[PDB]
Ligand binder design. Sequence first.
Ligand code: HEM
Ligand SMILES: CCCCCCCCCCCCCCCC(=O)O
Length: 429
Amino acid sequence: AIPQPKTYGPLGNLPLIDKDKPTLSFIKIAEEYGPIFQIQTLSDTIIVVSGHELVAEVCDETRFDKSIEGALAKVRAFAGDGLFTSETHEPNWKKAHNILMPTFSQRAMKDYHAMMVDIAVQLVQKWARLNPNENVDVPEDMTRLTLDTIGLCGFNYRFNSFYRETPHPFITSMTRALDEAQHDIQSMFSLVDNIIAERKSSGDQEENDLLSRMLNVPDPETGEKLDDENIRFQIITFLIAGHETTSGLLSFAIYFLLKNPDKLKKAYEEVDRVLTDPTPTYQQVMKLKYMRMILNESLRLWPTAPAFSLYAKEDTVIGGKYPIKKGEDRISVLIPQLHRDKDAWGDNVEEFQPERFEELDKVPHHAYKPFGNGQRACIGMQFALHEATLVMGMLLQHFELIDYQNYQLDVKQTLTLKPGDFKIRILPR
Ligand code: HEM
Ligand SMILES: CCCCCCCCCCCCCCCC(=O)O
């Protein structure tokens, strides 16, 4: 039987978790009960898997599929049947997957690079125009950048987050729809439908982005284009799935570089050697290999999307001993503990060492899952890593980052993980 922490009659296992800190709570219980355990709530049971062998076993696509059972079922209210919140067997999933997969390749990022630079320059100019001793809020400015980059690169819409003191009506409306996990959802649907209507009427200009892609390219298997409602769901899906996770990545990367001076010094080395022009080029961004290893290490230590869920396709066993009823038990992957599995990663799991990714043969894959698994893995992986590398390189090109308050990490979790109350100061170089 699957290990279980305790039980308190009607209360299940909930007396052992902080409802506001689910991932961290599960980390604690994992430290107590090992690579697999089950948590009983008032209504259901969750199986939390964290050992790399069991995680790899549950990652077998023949036996397990993506589950949308809990948080994602709430996100579904406004994300609908988009890539993030649709079941694999639903038709629009593989339709949109085939349609949009080439646009998210690394070669396709060559097409988005300019727009990414646009928003990056905005961030840099903001920080350069600060008055002496003004503080910057790393998560909020990173979120400004990530939301604007996704809007511009994806459907050529400028949120202009850097022209606002309070985050955009869309992002607070989205936070209200998520803190539910109707007014707001309808306003979101209409804004997206407005951009879609602007594009379908007089769609002359070669915008060459995600919306034009969904309007032009059909699914080669079915021969069909995505319908309008699903395109709306896809645009909302890109916004939610991209901006928060990628801004969390940027914030954690800035934190780790501030707390590990050697890695920052090496990053300065690489950026100065590569970033010679005022604005980076796509080729130059790819040359920033050490920065991308810094990002890989940051995602290992604090995966901004800390979990994904699976369901069993037919009755089976894990580890040779733990049974799973078919399609009834929701398996949650505890990505931080998986990323701290010493048998797969070694002993220095808590150290910030980008050099773990120095040699692409040595990285223990299937114990490194910051972007999900298999066919339901993150379609925006290359988008996110390219954008994050660009922003980090540019910030290091222009700025000296100062830990003026001696920041003490506090991992806040909403739907994603991020540093809470993270403020620094900046100087020009
Ligand atoms: C650091 C940045 C990011 C992280 C850590 C991340 C993480 C993830 C994870 C873990 C999943 C799998 C979720 C599950 O299987 O339940 C996923 C899926 C997805 N992500 Fe990302 N993501 C990031 C950036 C982005 C960006 C930039 C975009 C879009 C521009 C995006 C769009 C999506 C979509 C559409 C899916 C659904 C994939 C499918 O099953 O078809 N993500 N992401
Ligand atoms: C930063 C560390 C976070 C760790 C989260 C562990 C907190 C939960 C420990 C057991 C529950 C104790 C109180 C939680 C609230 C409650 O019981 O109503």
